[PDB]
Design a protein around this nucleic acid. Structure first.
Lengths: 174, 199, 141, 52, 79
RNA sequence: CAUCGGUUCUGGCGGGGGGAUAAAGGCCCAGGGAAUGUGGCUCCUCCGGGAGUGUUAUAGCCCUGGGUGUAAUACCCUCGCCGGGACCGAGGACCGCGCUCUGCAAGGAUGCUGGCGUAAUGGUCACCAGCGACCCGUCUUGAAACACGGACCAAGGAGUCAA
């Protein structure tokens, strides 16, 4: 759902005379920008507690950058999505380099495979699989295999679309 | 000259004060909640056809009678409810100093005897707003940006801004909320890019 | 309103012309009722009598309003606090303006609506934020 | 007879604002921040940032 | 079926304006009738929603159960 | 063509600020750990390679803290500078606001140069080409359709006068 970033959004209920120090609630939200991040925070907080935007305040919004974006990692995403039947769980895994990239790939994959949009997907947990035996789906169990070397058969050469006519028939072996 | 020097120093001190307060709160292990924005810039981005009477009346009271008309609004509950009602027709957010000064320099027109006179001289501002202390274009920009005691008089003296269409266009679906992927509603500090494109 | 005896402080309220009163029809006593409409309406006293008051209401007919004068007993009328927020404000503002003129420093003379909040610092000591998932884990259990 | 943009015409800019030349000469848009060694972020802030 | 050698009359996908207007009107009336039947429906509806739960394939389901354990223990101790 | 003014499109460059004073990352320092286990050792062998062992060895990796470090860069905001192009020149002594003040980009285009001085520009008509374009009245009703009138042309032809 766009170039996503992860946000620590901390909010709270407005302090009253009865409760001088209300509790602070912190969430990690994948959103394109801070407005969407705060909107999703208020939506999820209305789903859990007696806080809404007119009776609460946003204490903090901080971008959570990935610690090691140059390290290839395996991510497990546990999520719930809405269909015509109802709410369903899925656990999926994605081999990426960051949590935001894994979440973007998840959104594209769920849109492609189950026609679920951003409005009907809830991200419950995103974890890093620290060990290889934590990998369960076969399409990444085949990627974590020892000595993974494969060719690239039938590679169509990248020819410029503005060059209409070519003088020789292209090869698909490079 | 001395007034403009004072205003530039004040802007720099406010920005550094906000950054310093945020850093000190972060260092002592707390969270500095910034003050809520007191100024918004409201642009009407929908036409004049098929509009209900209550949003039509609110859009006339906001002096937004044409598409791509912009006004400065002081944030209060009384105007916030009005903007909430006319949300399907307008896009609003928090402008910065560059947006304010570029708007009043390029599309700055005052209302003199019911006439739209361009702000090409400080003299015009001196006759029409000198009784409130606003004698120059920099003082007008300062009053608009800092929301002074004479913000109502300054904003009413300023004619509604007639902006052009954005360079680069809108989003693919425009008449939809900015949270949903469109352009309506409060986009907060993202109004500045729209002001650059429209102005 | 319970069945039985009417409270007696209804008869001990002193009524003058120009007062703003509303019409709450008491079902127990039949004498001196207004019409079915003009019930729950608020108006101005123009005539006071031994046991009833005259109230000016403004009815609407078609595309205009017509002044109506009604004679309603004291048992169905009640003092209205619509101008209480005006009388308390005018007394408070008058004495405050007198005090401010005596002192020298001008004060705020008009009531202001709800302004946006200013900046403040919230400490996380002993109030550490808790992390919430979109669904509660106890609920998932 | 002709409205001239102060953001393009410097003479109109100096007519409306005499401080523009002083601003450009003293480089007030390129003011460097105050010097000093910045204290590091507390570890509790990073722990709350990366808390799952 | 002898469809390749002798195809039959093609089925037009080009929509008729009258047909589309009638279908839109019928859809709006069906939505209204479903709203009326939902308002007049006497079938029981639970206020609580059944929790879909936690998948078994999640590898840290043990760990999740642990912080649930000390969370409920800390809540009971504080209460 | 040059120098300008107004509007606008587009490209490049020099700075400043912010965040976890980006996150990384490199080079060092101090710990801990594991396998998709490196070297070594052992056992099978088609001796091509596998299997077992353990924590760096004759490869390396991950995690934590510290120094360089106020590192760089990405992203966002912002202050300016330099190019390339298009369209437009309203007004007609001075006045005004100004500035970089012998003057000027400051209340709206001037300077230089060339060809021609006539159908060359321009216009009208006929035709072709690209795009657009249902037959007029009247009536109906909310409207359309239906229906009614129209072969063509010239002249005549319908809210007037009195009280």
């Amino acid at each position: 759902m766009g170039r996503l970033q992860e946000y620590q959004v901390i909010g709270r209920h407005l302090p009253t005379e009865a409760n001088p120090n209300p509790a602070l609630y912190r969430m990690r939200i994948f959103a394109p920008n801070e407005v969407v991040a705060k909107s999703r925070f208020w939506y999820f907080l209305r789903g859990l507690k007696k806080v809404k935007k007119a009776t609460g305040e946003i204490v903090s919004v901080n971008v959570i950058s990935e610690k090691h974006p140059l390290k290839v990692k395996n991510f497990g995403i546990w999520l719930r999505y809405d269909s015509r039947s109802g709410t369903h769980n899925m656990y999926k895994e994605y081999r990426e380099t960051s949590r935001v990239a894994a979440v973007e790939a998840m959104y594209a994959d769920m849109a492609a495979r189950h026609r679920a949009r951003f409005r009907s997907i809830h991200i419950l947990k995103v974890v890093e699989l620290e060990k290889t035996e934590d990998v369960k789906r076969p399409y990444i169990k085949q990627l974590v295999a020892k000595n993974l070397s494969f060719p690239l058969p039938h590679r169509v050469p990248k020819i410029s679309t503005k060059k209409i006519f070519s003088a020789k028939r292209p090869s698909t072996f490079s | 000259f001395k007034r403009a020097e004072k205003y530039v120093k004040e802007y720099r001190e406010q920005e550094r004060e906000k950054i310093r307060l945020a850093r000190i709160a972060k260092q002592q292990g707390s969270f500095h909640i910034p003050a809520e924005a007191k100024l918004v810039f409201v642009i009407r981005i929908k036409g004049i056809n098929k509009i209900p009477p209550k949003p039509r009346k609110i859009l006339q009271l906001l002096r937004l009678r044409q598409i791509n008309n912009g006004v400065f609004v002081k944030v209060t509950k009384a105007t916030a409810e009005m903007i909430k009602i006319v949300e399907p027709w307008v896009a609003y957010g928090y402008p910065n100093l560059k947006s304010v000064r570029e708007l009043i320099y390029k599309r700055g027109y005052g209302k003199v005897n019911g006439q739209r006179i361009p702000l090409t001289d400080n003299a015009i501002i001196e006759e029409n707003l000198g009784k409130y202390g606003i004698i120059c274009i920099e003082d007008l920009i300062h009053e608009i940006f800092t929301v002074g005691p004479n913000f109502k008089q300054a904003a009413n003296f300023l004619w509604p801004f007639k902006l052009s269409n954005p360079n680069g266009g809108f989003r693919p679906r425009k008449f939809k909320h900015f949270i949903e992927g469109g352009d309506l509603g409060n986009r907060e500090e993202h109004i500045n890019a729209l002001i650059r494109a429209m102005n | 309103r319970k069945h039985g005896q009417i409270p007696l402080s209804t008869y001990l309220r002193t009524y003058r012309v120009g007062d703003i009163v509303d019409i709450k029809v008491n079902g127990a006593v039949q004498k001196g009722m207004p019409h079915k409409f003009y019930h729950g309406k608020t108006g101005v006293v123009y005539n006071v009598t031994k046991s009833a008051v005259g109230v000016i209401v403004y009815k609407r007919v078609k595309h205009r309003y017509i002044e109506k004068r009604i004679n309603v007993r004291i048992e169905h009328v009640k003092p209205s606090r619509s101008r209480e927020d005006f009388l308390r404000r005018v007394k408070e503002n008058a004495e405050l303006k007198k005090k401010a003129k005596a002192e020298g420093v001008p004060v705020q003379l008009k009531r202001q609506p709800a302004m946006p909040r200013e900046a403040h610092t919230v400490s996380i000591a002993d109030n550490k934020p808790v992390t919430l998932a979109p669904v509660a884990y106890e609920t998932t259990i | 007879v002709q409205k001239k943009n102060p953001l393009r015409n410097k003479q109109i800019m100096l007519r409306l604002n005499p401080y523009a030349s002083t601003f450009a000469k003293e480089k007030l848009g390129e003011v460097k921040a105050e010097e000093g060694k910045p204290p590091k972020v507390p570890a509790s802030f990073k722990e709350l940032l990366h808390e799952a | 079926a002898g469809t390749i050698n002798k195809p039959k009359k093609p089925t037009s996908k080009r929509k008729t304006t009258r047909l589309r207007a009638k279908i839109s009107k019928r859809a709006a009336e069906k939505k209204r009738k479903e709203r009326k039947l939902a308002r007049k429906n006497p079938e029981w509806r639970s206020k609580l929603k059944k929790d879909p739960g936690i998948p078994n394939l999640f590898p840290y389901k043990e760990r999740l159960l642990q912080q649930i354990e000390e969370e409920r223990i800390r809540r009971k101790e504080e209460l």
